Design a binder for this molecule. Structure first.
Ligand SMILES: *[C@H](C)[C@H]1/C(=C/c2[nH]c(/C=C3N=C(/C=C4\NC(=O)C(CC)=C4C)C(C)=C\3CCC(=O)O)c(CCC(=O)O)c2C)NC(=O)[C@@H]1C
Ligand SMILES: *[C@H](C)[C@H]1/C(=C/c2[nH]c(/C=C3N=C(/C=C4\NC(=O)C(CC)=C4C)C(C)=C\3CCC(=O)O)c(CCC(=O)O)c2C)NC(=O)[C@@H]1C
Lengths: 161, 160, 160, 161, 160, 161, 160, 161, 160, 161, 161, 160
């Protein structure tokens, strides 16, 4: 994986360049937002379970999805689905701390679209589950962090569609 | 980075970051501007550091620039300073990342095998790095010189 | 079923069925018509069993239908009886299969995680199931009531 | 895998239906043939080795197949072939007990056609080895069970061709 | 037994017995007296079963009691019937246990290696067992004769 | 392991004896109590968690054991202790079904006394935890089964002391 | 601690500490006196924090102190505040260690199983901890209140 | 393992005590020496190989130990011995950072005396190899750190004798 | 061959051939012409060796060519000598390869399972091979007869 | 393990001596018997099964050992016993080829006496099984090799007693 | 894999033919070159490292390949590349000893072209690294062996292109 | 030896020695007296071989006996020839064993780590061994000189 800082280092390493003014400006733009990323992660982590619960309630359950014939019918599959939800939340929190989406590609999106096609897992319904968790997250983390958390949920959801 | 290291440990244990892990990200990022200044100063004096490192090296080990020496000759010496320029660059990367991930993948993992093939005496490369520490460290405030010094001593350590 | 369970153990040890395994298939299939009758009776009284289970439950645990209770309200209670209808259905499946394979994949594996998320008190779901045992069991002959009762006590067991 | 009984349970579960009259009639149609399935399995199991021997003798050996250039030439490959034969016999006995062919798909047929194409294993010759074991089986198990055993051998053989 | 088999599967998955497992223990134990009667009848006629099995065997396979036969001679035949007495005994054990655990550890696991060493033709031992089935089965009611027959066909199966 | 029935079979096998009248009487004495053993196991299994809870409440917690300096202090050790309790209950249920204590020796008692000495686990306190679960069990299972369940709890507890 | 965590990772990869690992030990130890002050203040007000946490808790969740509630009664409430006193203590330990190792082994690993047995509602224990954060945090400077707050939110996180 | 800080936390945890003045004084006594421990570790790590080389030269080689009949005769055993030396150096550096010897017991000394008796490894000679590395270390790390590094080498060496 | 065996061990340990491995290739290849002569002589007399082996076999074991014998009859005997022709061929292959790799994959791995199915008495196949040793060995010089004899005794060994 | 030749090399290596006249004489005494060792191994290997059969027949079976109560009662234990016999024969053949008993200690005798005491395996009866295989071996291998094969069977048997 | 000799044996085995004059002539053509193959392998093995060094120096390093943006930039990748080189040299030495290229297909070429396409490894540059090692090898091994070593390097290089 | 190597492979696959393995033991033992003569000649000239090897070495690589050289000085040179005496000894062992087992455990496994510590240039030790090959080989017949040469080239190979 890479973060903001190693994204820059590797981009310069392939050119064998010492870090110059443009590079140093990018890294500053990361460091200057760093404390806010940390606070936001502590809110998400400590509200993890409630975010999933409120996101499922707005976007998944009370529906045909949870009824016989639906993909989140059976305690087995309901458990698998909210298990997935926890992955998304947790990794988006990593991406936002790192200030780089590369981890969402390497460890979450790669092959996932076809995995879901192969099992029958409804893609559009999963995206709504992602964009509902974003909605909840953006309330809990506040002005400071709302836009920055949000983008990696949006990265996740356009990665499936 | 500090970020990459913290996260990789988090993901591998299937969990959110610890209070500890969060704290170090916070302390690290607070030192951002300072770390960037340390890299700038050293980037700004790279040619001096390399050249003066190269003199300090050949006094301490004249055998490498002698008949049966790996760096014997004008262009066997030119490549030798170029390698010293490489490692100073990696040291600036490490300082701004706050750990060695980048330094390691780029220039220590595989370095024994590379230099053994070329028949380069590894421990005299470690000396060239100590020599760079001495020069670079004389262009930095006490506090910044120590922070830089850890990364120089790491490279010296890894060639071992 | 009894068939699935016997076979899976056979195939996993790369062998034909044992005398024991063959015997249980034979005893099981002999009880076929009886097991089908037990499921029919209970299917035929499902609405009564659920409703009377639901009264028995809320007397014994009025806290779930109270201000800070998971089943508080008319539609939080409606879903609660629907879940009781689900489990009675799975119990009829189990009785005709002669084991839990189906009951298990459909409604116990993952049930802790599901209900923890919804914040449903698991042990009061176990009570709702005991309540259904009591009602269902009063509509069956002694011998059939016991045979049914094992599957009710299993579900009660798995929510634990 | 599934058997007669779980085939019905899962078909109703996806509709969330309690078992109705049509379902109950199907299950009876299985239970009522159950004792006969068991007796037939005990004959096959206890004559396993003789069935393979007589099936190979009628349909495989004394031929170009067992001669140099043939796929069951070498003790290695002769052993692999009658090993396979034992799989078929054994699994068909499972399918017939279960009263459902689903196990023959899940654990025997899936990928097997191409596996045989990739090794060079002669498909038509293998089918004859299956239909010869069926012939022997149908004699040994008697009127009671002959038709019921037979179908899962026929399932196996149209699964390859 | 049926008990041992059920339990071992329970303990290995770290769990209490299933409704299925409980049911088979119940059906099994109900057949206790019947199974004990089946063993008694056969124990009571052991000498007849063995002797008549031994005649049926040597007609069907006279080669084993011939110059180059494993059972050629009076005391090579005496040991052969003694082995037939051994297996009938194990069959009575299996019937009262309701599975093969005991039959298996005592007389099939290792039997190929034992008889290969002695150079005993295994498939003609399987015939001696079929011969015993035929005799034993003629001293039992239809229902009990089948129940016994499964265990005879198992041994015949394992020598294969 | 062995049960009632295999205890008898192996005792006769070493003498090479067919089962005689004395043997047959023993096996009857087991079969005749069999249905009651099954019912008792279904009560214990389905009340497992409540039995542990009531046994701990009467014999372990509200004490120095659960306080700092005590062996069941820390959520870690409290969890390990009631985990153990579940083993005992579960295995005693096996022993009682089998009608033989041999499984309690093979898979529970062997080395356990010294294991507890090595960790510091209080033996006397653990015995009380066993004899409290017995007390609860004997109420729940009723006249039919009380004495038979009880003995394997008593086997467990004199195995430690 | 930060020390234990760094070292364990070092030893497990068979190596000396990284520049990163060395840096965090240095930043950590520099915050020693401050961290000790944060623990002192909270130790000094423990009885107030617990009591006011306990009021804040029972308003927000009156159901736990009601007929069918885990903490219903005077001595079921006394034990409940004692558990709140336990967790505040562990939070002071964590703050001075700079990570959770101690907090974790003492009071989260096994906590689900413990409280499930006692039938304590876990999420309302998490609320009791939030309530303590609110009180404790009002007795600390902005900077120290945040540093403390991470450890409160961890415990809240682990009960989940 | 434990360090200075967790040594104190666990000593109070078993009494269920909040940290008091005496505890807080101990922890200060650790924190106040912390920066010096770090600098010392960086010197040892980066001179690791030279310390072993100079320690072996003063205390092991040029001797009967390296000659036929000696325990560090053969490239195999010479390699094993200086491998060991690296362990000692590395772990002593851990102990000194932690300000606690507990890791030297848990991961180095436990069983080592008898392991060496069983292989024939000369104990007295190994101690001299430890006390020679200490001598070198104490020069390299300077006044600040000399006494603190030294004690964990002395812990190691009285652990073998 | 000797080559294949040496190399496979080399590659599996990720290394060049040993002095030992190189030496045996050298000694082996020096015996090339001799080994080729040994195979030629035996190839040249194959029909005689088989036929005289077949007589020697049926005297020593007349039971296989008797009513209940695997080789009883004219065409059950024809296939039996054909199998003896197969194994002599494989023995010529082994001698020119200097080890059994080829002999093994072609005619011993799986041979127990093949012949058990056909119900062929394995130990009398081993006798047929001893019989071929005796004939073949009488057409070779002392030194070449021994070298050949090792490969005959191997096959005799593997059918065991 | 070691053979004749490496026994000498290691005895000199510990003294750091080049091979001298006494050493060279020992190695000759091995090489000069080498061809005979090979021929003997080929006889044993190719008669392996018959040697075990004749050794068991003279020294084990037709006895109380094979009867109920005996240690080689049950097909399981009979198989384990002749399995063991094959080990002995096979390893003795290794020792005799190597011209050194060290392999019989390293891979056969170490712990075996107590292993047999722990299982109840009759030691004296096992020795007779060894000395019967020796008797058969000495006939089959002839004058050339009889004494040399024999000693490693005698090594095995005084290793148990 | 196969060598010269097993190539012939398997070609005849599939026809079930005893070796005839044409076969025997082929095998002679191998045996008659055998001693020379061995000597050549001992030169290559013992000069392995120098051959790689001289081959890299003529065909890989002092170039854009070793500079930033190049595939053998970074000590990691430089190490991987000369690691590969050692494989080629070592396996070509196997092929030449065996007198058969089949091992180069089975264990080196299969999938390697696409593996290199997938990582970005420059194929043409790798071929030059192969043909430079051949050049060095052909000098070191001499007239006797030059042509025979050379062909398996040429086999390797047309296997990639 | 050849014996040890053959046997270890036999035992590890749970089997008797192959025809191939038996053949190489036979060819090996036939070369016994010759191999013993090769070791004797070289043992008899050890002091000459070492000394002349040492001159050949220092001409070809004068840098090791120079200011910054590992073997610089009279007693740093004395130890260097002693190491050359060690390796010649091991070469005599290898020749009489017919493989490297002994040579390997005594003087190559661990040799990189030993000499890296002492900072001895490994490739110039490999040169010292080539130098010994040249001298030793001039005291042996063509055939014996080659047989010896394989073991010299092995050591040269292993220091790589
Ligand atoms: C003669 C010494 C013994 C004997 C032999 C016998 N063999 C058969 C039948 C077959 N034998 C084989 C053998 C091989 N196939 C192979 O690929 C190889 C490796 C090269 C061997 C050794 C096969 C395949 C058959 C089946 C016939 C066929 O070729 O398709 C029989 C006939 C048995 C039958 O039931 O038809 C006999 C009699 N018989 C003895 O008693 C001797 C011990
Ligand atoms: C209050 C916020 C909640 C609550 C608590 C409650 N707890 C208990 C009983 C116990 N709690 C513990 C807790 C611990 N033991 C430990 O070692 C640690 C780690 C430091 C902790 C946190 C223990 C051991 C007990 C058992 C009593 C004992 O100490 O022996 C009760 C009483 C329950 C009962 O059945 O007796 C209550 C009420 N109750 C709530 O509802 C809140 C959510």
């Amino acid at each position: 994986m890479q973060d903001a800082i190693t994204a820059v280092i590797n981009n310069y390493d392939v050119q064998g360049k010492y870090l110059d003014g443009a590079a140093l400006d990018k890294l500053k733009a990361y460091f200057t937002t760093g404390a806010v990323r940390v606070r936001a992660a502590a809110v998400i982590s400590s509200n993890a379970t409630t975010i999933i619960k409120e996101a499922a309630a707005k976007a998944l359950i009370y529906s045909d999805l949870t009824r016989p014939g639906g993909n989140m019918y059976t305690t087995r599959r309901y458990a698998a689905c909210i298990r997935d939800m926890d992955y998304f939340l947790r990794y988006a929190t990593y991406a936002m701390l790192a200030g780089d989406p590369s981890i969402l590609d390497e460890r979450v999106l790669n092959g996932l679209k076809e995995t879901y096609n192969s099992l029958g897992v409804p893609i559009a319904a999963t995206v709504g589950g992602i964009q509902a968790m974003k909605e909840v997250v953006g309330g809990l983390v506040g002005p400071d962090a709302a836009k920055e958390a949000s983008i990696y949920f949006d990265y996740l959801s356009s990665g499936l569609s | 980075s500090v970020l990459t290291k913290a996260i990789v440990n988090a993901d591998a244990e299937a969990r959110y970051l610890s209070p500890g892990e969060l704290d170090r990200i916070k302390s690290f990022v607070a030192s951002g501007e300072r770390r960037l200044r340390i890299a700038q100063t050293l980037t700004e004096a790279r040619e001096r550091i390399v050249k003066q490192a190269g003199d300090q090296l050949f006094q301490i080990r004249p055998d490498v620039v002698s008949p049966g020496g790996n760096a014997y000759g004008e262009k066997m010496t030119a490549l030798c300073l170029r390698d010293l320029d490489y490692y100073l660059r990696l040291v600036t990367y490490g300082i701004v990342a706050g750990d060695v991930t980048p330094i390691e993948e780029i220039g220590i993992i595989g370095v024994k095998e590379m230099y053994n093939s070329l028949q380069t005496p590894i421990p005299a490369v470690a000396e060239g790095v100590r020599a760079m520490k001495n020069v670079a460290t004389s262009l930095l405030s006490g506090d910044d010189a120590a922070e830089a010094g850890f990364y120089f001593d790491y490279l010296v350590g890894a060639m071992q």
